[PDB]
């Protein structure tokens, strides 16, 4: 398993503009287009991201291309973040994938906010961090995805995904 595979499982793949769990316009593999309620605004952002008049539909290749960019942006965002970087650097391979998933999902800023869980992860107190991570809006809104990520941090294995 790897990060791409993991995120592909959590986000799925849709080739036509859809609304995410928060009601925002998204396409592909969890690629958020806009938080605006306007579908045209969405279509406009899609066209701009893809580089052609799409009419709200993209191909599989196009989808994977946005995905590759997005995973790369997430990693680079972590590495650039003063709060995240040290955490990421301290972790094993599996658990770094967990941190990336969270950033992919909520953004660097959102994640940098789990101060306490961050300190706990860095200190390798697995069970404590999981308990803290679960007390969050994130967990209450997308409990199954959150539980998968949380288990990965707890265990250091891909079991939640097999
Ligand atoms: Cl983009
Ligand atoms: Cl969920």
From Swiss-Prot:
EC number annotated for this UniProt entry? 3.2.1.17
Source organism = Enterobacteria phage T4
Q: Which PANTHER family match?
A: T4-TYPE LYSOZYME 1-RELATED
Q: What is the effect of changing residue 26 to E?
A: Complete loss of activity at neutral pH; covalently bound substrate
Induction comment: Expressed late in the viral replication.
Functional summary from the UniProt entry: Endolysin with lysozyme activity that degrades host peptidoglycans and participates with the holin and spanin proteins in the sequential events which lead to the programmed host cell lysis releasing the mature viral particles. Once the holin has permeabilized the host cell membrane, the endolysin can reach the periplasm and break down the peptidoglycan layer.
Q: What is this protein called?
A: Endolysin
The record gives the effect of mutating residue 11 to A/F/H/M/N as: Complete loss of enzymatic activity
The reaction(s) annotated as catalysed by this protein in its Swiss-Prot or TrEMBL entry are: Hydrolysis of (1->4)-beta-linkages between N-acetylmuramic acid and N-acetyl-D-glucosamine residues in a peptidoglycan and between N-acetyl-D-glucosamine residues in chitodextrins
* Protein keywords: Antimicrobial, Bacteriolytic enzyme, Cytolysis, Glycosidase, Host cell lysis by virus, Host cytoplasm, Hydrolase, Viral release from host cell
- Please give the annotated consequence of changing residue 132 to I: 5-fold decrease in enzymatic activity
Family from the record: Belongs to the glycosyl hydrolase 24 family.
InterPro entries the UniProt entry points to: Endolysin_T4_type, Glyco_hydro_24, Lysozyme-like_dom_sf, Lysozyme_dom_sf, Phage_lysozyme-like, T4-type_lysozyme
Which biological process annotations from GO are given for this protein?
cell wall macromolecule catabolic process; defense response to bacterium; peptidoglycan catabolic process; viral release from host cell by cytolysis
Give the chief site where it resides.
host cell
Residues where substrate binds: 32, 104, 117, 132
What would you give as a GO molecular function for this chain, any one?
Answer: lysozyme activity
Q: How does activity depend on pH?
A: Optimum pH is 7.3.
Q: Which domain of life is it from?
A: Viruses
């Amino acid at each position: 398993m790897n990060i791409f595979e993991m995120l592909r499982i959590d986000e799925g793949l849709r080739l036509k503009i859809y609304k995410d769990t928060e009601g925002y316009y998204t396409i592909g593999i969890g690629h958020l287009l806009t938080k605006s309620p306007s579908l045209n605004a969405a279509k406009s952002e899609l066209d701009k991201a893809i580089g052609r008049n799409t009419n709200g539909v993209i191909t599989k290749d196009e989808a994977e291309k946005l995905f590759n960019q997005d995973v790369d942006a997430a990693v680079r965002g972590i590495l650039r973040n003063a709060k995240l970087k040290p955490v990421y650097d301290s972790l094993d391979a599996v658990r770094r994938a967990a941190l990336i998933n969270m950033v992919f999902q909520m953004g660097e800023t959102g994640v940098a906010g789990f101060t306490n869980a961050l300190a706990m992860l860095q200190q390798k107190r697995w069970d404590e961090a999981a308990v803290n991570l679960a007390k969050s809006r994130w967990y209450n809104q997308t409990p199954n995805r959150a539980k998968r990520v949380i288990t990965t941090f707890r265990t250091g294995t891909w079991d939640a995904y097999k």
